[PDB]
Design an enzyme around this catalytic site. Structure first.
Site, short mmCIF file in Angstrom:
data_model
loop_
_atom_site.label_atom_id
_atom_site.label_comp_id
_atom_site.label_asym_id
_atom_site.label_seq_id
_atom_site.Cartn_x
_atom_site.Cartn_y
_atom_site.Cartn_z
N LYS A 84 0.73 -1.16 0.07
CA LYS A 84 0.07 -0.03 0.02
C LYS A 84 0.73 1.31 0.06
O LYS A 84 0.61 2.11 -0.70
CB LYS A 84 -0.90 0.21 1.10
CG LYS A 84 -1.90 -1.14 1.27
CD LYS A 84 -2.96 -0.79 2.27
CE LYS A 84 -3.95 -2.18 2.21
NZ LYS A 84 -3.42 -3.37 2.43
N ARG B 156 -9.50 21.06 19.46
CA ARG B 156 -8.12 20.63 20.30
C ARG B 156 -7.88 21.60 21.38
O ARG B 156 -8.41 22.86 21.26
CB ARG B 156 -6.85 20.65 19.57
CG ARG B 156 -6.96 20.16 18.31
CD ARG B 156 -6.92 18.41 18.44
NE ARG B 156 -5.37 18.30 19.14
CZ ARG B 156 -5.11 16.90 19.76
NH1 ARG B 156 -6.00 16.01 19.80
NH2 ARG B 156 -4.19 16.85 20.16
#
Ligand SMILES: [Mg+2]
Ligand SMILES: [Mg+2]
Ligand code: NA
Ligand code: NA
Length: 326
Positions: free
Chosen positions: A63, A140
């Site tokens: 991949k 965040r």
DNA sequence: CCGACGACGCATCAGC
DNA sequence: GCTGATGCGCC
DNA sequence: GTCGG
């Protein structure tokens, strides 16, 4: 971040296997490879170069070769287009909605943010609050804000009992510039591994933090663990702070070092450490390190008087909290 | 080849 | 009501 | 999906 594209790809595949396939070990395998690639100090040229790293096998190597050549991965491109998968992946972002609930909602046509909002009576309590602060929970927390929340929690806890000790763990203790949430270890002299000399020790603190309007919501609550929501106070005319996830964990005073090791993390670091503990003949949880007797059964708790001792048993050189962000 | 993959608290449910 | 299994989440 | 036995 030298290999940010690769790790993003692997993290996405991890989330696919966890949410859609419901294959928890594939999710873990992908997250592991992402972790060991994340701290690899070279810009990776080939999949074969990556296969050298522990956790990267044949499939991920192939991949990575596809990604580096084309900038994409056909396996993810298709998954991005699959309607059922896109839905499940979204629903699972709501705290309280896991792989099973996500797939069950889709079967009823409830698959968008709008559908969830017109059907709150079908969510449990956790899911409703998760839906409530869906936007806030994807933001965040700057370390600047973590420091503010720390002063509030540490001072409010001091007000209930001077002998409470609160320690903000998680990525904050790991010295991160930002945190996804706040994690609080709590100890009180009365609660040891020998006796609970005093009831409601976690409750008192939760109630106190609620009274000063810090803790605004509860996701789950027991004798030792609290899961809920908190918000910093804003001044006049200020736009309010986003609501933040907070976890509070009451650990027996004498088991502090195993507890503080555990919620300091990271989650992958713990798993790598605990897996290594088994290979060395020990089992580690939040409470104790225990030997593995001749036939599998865990022995009695070994003495622990620092975080380093746990590292010593399994033959690991000590790693500062800032070096555990795997 | 193939068994094992860290370890646990809380909410929730099924069975009795 | 108790016991255990399952879902979801925490690091 | 990967790895150690
Ligand atoms: Mg955290
Ligand atoms: Mg947390
Ligand atoms: Na490898
Ligand atoms: Na979720």
């Amino acid at each position: 971040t030298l290999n940010g594209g690769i790790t993003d790809m692997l993290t996405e595949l991890a989330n696919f296997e966890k949410n859609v396939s419901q294959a928890i070990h594939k999710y873990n395998a992908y997250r592991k490879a992402a972790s060991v690639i994340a701290k690899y100090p070279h810009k990776i040229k080939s999949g074969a170069e990556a296969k050298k790293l522990p956790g990267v096998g044949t499939k991920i190597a192939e991949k990575i070769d596809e990604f580096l050549a084309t900038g994409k991965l056909r396996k993810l491109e298709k998954i991005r287009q699959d309607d059922t998968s896109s839905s499940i992946n979204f629903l699972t972002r709501v705290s309280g909605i896991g792989p099973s609930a996500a797939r069950k909602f889709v079967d009823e046509g409830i698959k968008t943010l709008e559908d969830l909002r017109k059907n709150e009576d079908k969510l449990n309590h956790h899911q409703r609050i998760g839906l409530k602060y869906f936007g806030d929970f994807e933001k965040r927390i700057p370390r600047e804000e973590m420091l503010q929340m720390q002063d509030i929690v540490l001072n409010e806890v001091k007000k209930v009992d001077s002998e409470y000790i609160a320690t903000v763990c998680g990525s904050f203790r790991r010295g991160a510039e930002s945190s996804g949430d706040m994690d609080v270890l709590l100890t009180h002299p009365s609660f040891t591994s020998e006796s609970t000399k005093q009831p409601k020790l976690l409750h008192q603190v939760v109630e106190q933090l609620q009274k000063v309007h810090f803790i605004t919501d509860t996701l789950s609550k027991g004798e030792t663990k609290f899961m809920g929501v908190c918000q910093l106070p804003s001044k006049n005319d200020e736009k309010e702070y986003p609501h933040r996830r907070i976890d509070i964990r009451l650990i027996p005073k004498d088991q502090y070092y195993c507890g503080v090791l555990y919620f300091t993390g990271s989650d992958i670091f713990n798993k790598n450490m605990r897996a290594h503990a088994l290979e060395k003949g020990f089992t580690i949880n939040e409470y104790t390190i225990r030997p593995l007797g001749v036939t599998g059964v865990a022995g009695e708790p070994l003495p622990v008087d620092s975080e380093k001792d746990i590292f010593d048993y399994i033959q690991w050189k000590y790693r500062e909290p800032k070096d555990r962000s795997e």
